[PDB]
Design a protein around this ligand. Structure first.
Ligand SMILES: COc1cccc(CN(CCN(CC(=O)O)Cc2ccccc2SC)CC(=O)O)c1O
Ligand SMILES: [Cl-]
Ligand SMILES: [Fe+3]
Length: 498
């Protein structure tokens, strides 16, 4: 079956509610559901379900002219009415979308005709179009599949307009998609895609080696990285490594001793040998990160000063702040209190554990005692939400989220970044400026605001950037070159052409 492929994912795709989150998987929501406008690698959007649009002079009122030839996979029409009902369904659950500022900005959505859709905003919101382009929540399910005229309490069949249709799903076993033969756009070359549920990275590698699957596609956690390197030399296989898509880092709790001290956070940022970490734990497959956002990220080329690995500097900073070594001890003390920091991570994640152990070792070398707290996923996310951590592994979100959406979410208290930043004297100013940068259209001011926000976060040593990570691919050669999608969390299956 040349036009059928089998791949893997750590979990099922979920029920494919276009408007909800976990356990829904974003790449799968994007396979079935489509946006008004589609995100492009150059940062722009192109017409998609909307073929054109205009906006008022004040930038608060937008009118979209929709395609008139689009049907949902069940034959029902896509029109402005269906689109408007979707926006209502999403914003009826507005509290759940607080992280996404567009969901707080939309004041009204109404269908003016079958082809005219009008959206009104609280303010001129500059990332409007890019947030419409996201995998979720502003994509469109057939309104017939609402449950009692809503989606927040569940849907019936996951009926979208997209190039893929969910055929069937088996909890903890597999998901099967097929090509939408009545798609309004270009027909995918692939006719059927099977996702085998395989939570363990080694088991995924083994599944490929045995031929049980044709394709592996994911971030640095896709498979063991030593194994990936071996595969990249195996002439029976094909492998790919993308240019970096996002940052992996530690978040340091500015509201909790001892990471509440700037001098301590600064020292920690000099203590880790990132190159060695990446060569030791990531098998040399990723890039060193010096800043929250790579210099290639929009608005983030700011000439921020890296803190290079320098244990001598780290020690000096701690000594100057009164953190000194007692006789016959390797761990520093101040006011009799030991320099002890808890590093929280998902205990079953081998890669995270490996990095955590390297970080612990590096920090012990400069007199800081890091305790490793490996816990189940739910417990770690709970800690993130309420700030019950000293240090935690964290990551940015990739295009088109970085930086505007990641920054926007820093304002949401139930979220790791707010919690990490909560102890900063300048946190209210930062949150004020984040609000301002999203709504200004003085472009000069926009750049200045981004500079100030990112520079304060950098100078305050809120994060310990570790790596800019890449997408990775392992595939049967017969599938050919595997494309990457403009949106980092999407998988462009319809672009695969064996
Ligand atoms: C992934 C990949 C890229 C960006 C995000 C950020 N998400 C922000 C919304 N999260 C909800 C969720 O992922 O269930 C926020 C959030 C809340 C609690 C814990 C994690 C996260 S996202 C890391 C976008 C989304 O999920 O649609 C991801 O979760
Ligand atoms: Cl420990
Ligand atoms: Fe999320």
């Amino acid at each position: 079956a040349p036009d059928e492929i089998t791949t893997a994912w750590p979990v099922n795709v979920g029920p494919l509610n276009p408007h909800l989150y976990t356990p829904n998987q974003m790449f799968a929501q994007s396979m079935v559901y489509e946006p008004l406008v589609k995100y492009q690698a150059d940062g722009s959007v192109i017409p998609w379900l909307a073929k054109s649009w205009t906006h008022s002079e004040d930038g608060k009122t937008w009118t979209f002219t929709l395609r008139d030839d689009v049907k949902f996979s069940n034959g029902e029409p896509f029109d402005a009415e269906a689109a408007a009902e979707n926006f209502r369904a999403v914003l009826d659950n507005r509290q759940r979308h607080a992280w996404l500022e567009l969901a707080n900005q939309i004041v009204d959505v109404k269908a003016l005709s079958k082809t005219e859709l009008q959206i009104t905003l609280k303010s001129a919101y500059y990332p409007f179009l890019q947030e419409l382009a996201l995998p979720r929540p502003f994509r469109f399910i057939a309104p017939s599949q609402f449950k009692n005229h809503e989606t927040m309490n569940g849907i019936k069949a996951p009926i979208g307009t997209g190039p893929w249709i969910l055929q069937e799903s088996k909890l903890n076993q597999y998901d099967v998609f097929v090509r939408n033969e009545n798609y309004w756009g270009e027909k995918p070359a692939i006719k059927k895609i099977t996702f085998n549920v395989i939570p363990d990275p080694t088991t995924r590698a083994v599944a490929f080696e045995t031929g049980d699957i044709d394709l592996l596609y994911g971030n640095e956690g896709l498979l063991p990285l030593d194994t990936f390197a071996r595969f990249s030399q195996n002439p029976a296989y094909h492998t790919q490594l993308s240019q970096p898509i996002e940052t992996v880092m530690l978040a340091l709790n500015t509201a909790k001793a001892p990471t509440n001290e700037l001098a301590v956070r600064e020292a920690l940022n000099y203590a880790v040998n990132k190159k060695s970490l990446i060569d030791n734990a990531l098998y040399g497959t990723q890039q060193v990160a010096d800043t929250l956002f790579a210099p290639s990220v929009p608005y983030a080329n700011l000439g921020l000063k890296p803190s290079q690995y320098d244990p001598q500097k780290a020690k000096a900073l701690l000594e100057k702040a009164g953190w000194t070594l007692p006789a016959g001890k390797d761990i520093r003390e101040k006011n009799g209190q030991p320099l002890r920091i808890e590093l929280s991570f998902i205990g079953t994640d081998a890669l995270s554990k490996s990095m955590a152990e390297i970080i612990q070792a590096d920090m012990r070398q400069i007199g800081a005692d890091v305790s490793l707290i490996g816990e189940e996923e739910s417990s770690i996310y709970a800690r993130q939400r309420d700030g019950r951590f000293g240090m935690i592994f964290h990551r940015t979100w990739g295009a088109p989220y970085d930086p505007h959406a990641f920054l926007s979410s820093m304002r949401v208290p139930s979220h790791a970044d707010f919690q990490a930043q909560q102890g900063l004297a300048d946190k209210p100013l930062i949150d004020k400026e984040i609000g301002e940068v999203l709504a200004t259209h003085d472009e000069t001011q926009r750049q200045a605001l981004y500079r100030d926000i990112l520079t304060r976060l950098h100078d305050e040593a809120v994060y310990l950037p570790i790596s800019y990570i890449s997408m990775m691919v392992v595939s049967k050669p017969e599938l050919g070159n595997i494309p990457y999608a403009p949106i980092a969390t999407e998988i462009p299956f319809e672009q695969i052409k064996p």
